[PDB]
Amino acid sequence: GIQGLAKLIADVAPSAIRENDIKSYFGRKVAIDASMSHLMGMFYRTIRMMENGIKPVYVFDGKPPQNDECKHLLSLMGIPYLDAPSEAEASCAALVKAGKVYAAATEDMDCLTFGSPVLMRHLTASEAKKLPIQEFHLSRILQELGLNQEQFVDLCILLGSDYCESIRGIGPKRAVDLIQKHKSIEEIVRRLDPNKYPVPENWLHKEAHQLFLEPEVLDPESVELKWSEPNEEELIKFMCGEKQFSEERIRSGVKRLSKS
Ligand SMILES: [K+]
Ligand SMILES: [K+]
Ligand SMILES: [K+]
Ligand SMILES: [K+]
Ligand SMILES: [Mg+2]
Ligand SMILES: [Mg+2]
């Protein structure tokens, strides 16, 4: 994730966020961060997306920087999936950049840091929760803050990312001000009072910066994404016979999947 990024954007770049009903994404292809998003839950969430005309492609994590059952269910449902070489949401970003999908879907705000033009949050949320889709457009963030992607990456590092520490005591609004004035973390460190704001020791901000800018990602052109009809009998057999889920529950969902 990126700590505080969503709230910060709502505060200082509100035009970059839109809250939309799930119904409004009819016909959209969406790349889903499979790890952030168990079999019955995937079954139901995917059906809910398909009922609304959304065509999801699930992207699975590769090796981190430094599931066979789920894939079986997706194949039987007619839902495509991809193995990312590394972080799934970075490959989701690549699929958006390449025009293969409309948006990336994940709760991980660092999908924007990896450069995704569009990020949709809460798509995988259960229908009961009543959460509207939270949709971010990266270009609007950069335009509102007057930053380029490199500067945005350093801001996200200062906010707090998965891959390195942040500067203790530097708040989100303050981090924006520092990035706007100084452009890079290297310059910020020259200008900060070490007596007031000491930086972490052995700080890996350069390494994290390079990871966000040049992540290892799949090639969107290698696999043509396809959505097809489910294998209903095999689906029942696997989910009910092997995985002990309710035959009535599965049949109801399968019926809905075909009807959509
Ligand atoms: K938006
Ligand atoms: K840049
Ligand atoms: K950096
Ligand atoms: K690529
Ligand atoms: Mg991450
Ligand atoms: Mg992840």
From Swiss-Prot:
Cellular component aspect of the GO annotation: chromosome, telomeric region; membrane; mitochondrion; nucleolus; nucleoplasm; nucleus; protein-containing complex
Annotated positions binding Mg(2+) 2: 108, 110, 162
Enzyme Commission number(s) of this protein: 3.1.-.-
Domain of life: Eukaryota
Pfam families registered for this protein in UniProt: XPG_I, XPG_N
Cofactor stoichiometry and binding remark: Binds 2 magnesium ions per subunit. They probably participate in the reaction catalyzed by the enzyme. May bind an additional third magnesium ion after substrate binding.
Any one GO biological process: DNA replication, removal of RNA primer
Residue ranges of the region described as N-domain: 1-66
Residues the record lists as N6-acetyllysine modifications: 55
Amino-acid positions noted as binding DNA in the UniProt annotation, renumbered to this chain: 45, 87, 160, 162
Keyword Metal-binding set for record: yes
I-domain as annotated region, ranges: 67-182
PTM per Swiss-Prot/TrEMBL: Acetylated by EP300. Acetylation inhibits both endonuclease and exonuclease activity. Acetylation also reduces DNA-binding activity but does not affect interaction with PCNA or EP300.
A molecular-function term among this protein's GO annotations: double-stranded DNA exodeoxyribonuclease activity
Quaternary organization: Interacts with PCNA. Three molecules of FEN1 bind to one PCNA trimer with each molecule binding to one PCNA monomer. PCNA stimulates the nuclease activity without altering cleavage specificity. The C-terminal domain binds EP300; can bind simultaneously to both PCNA and EP300. Interacts with DDX11; this interaction is direct and increases flap endonuclease activity of FEN1. Interacts with WDR4; regulating its endonuclease activity. Interacts with POLB.
Family: Belongs to the XPG/RAD2 endonuclease family. FEN1 subfamily.
Protein name: Flap endonuclease 1
Species of origin: Homo sapiens (Human)
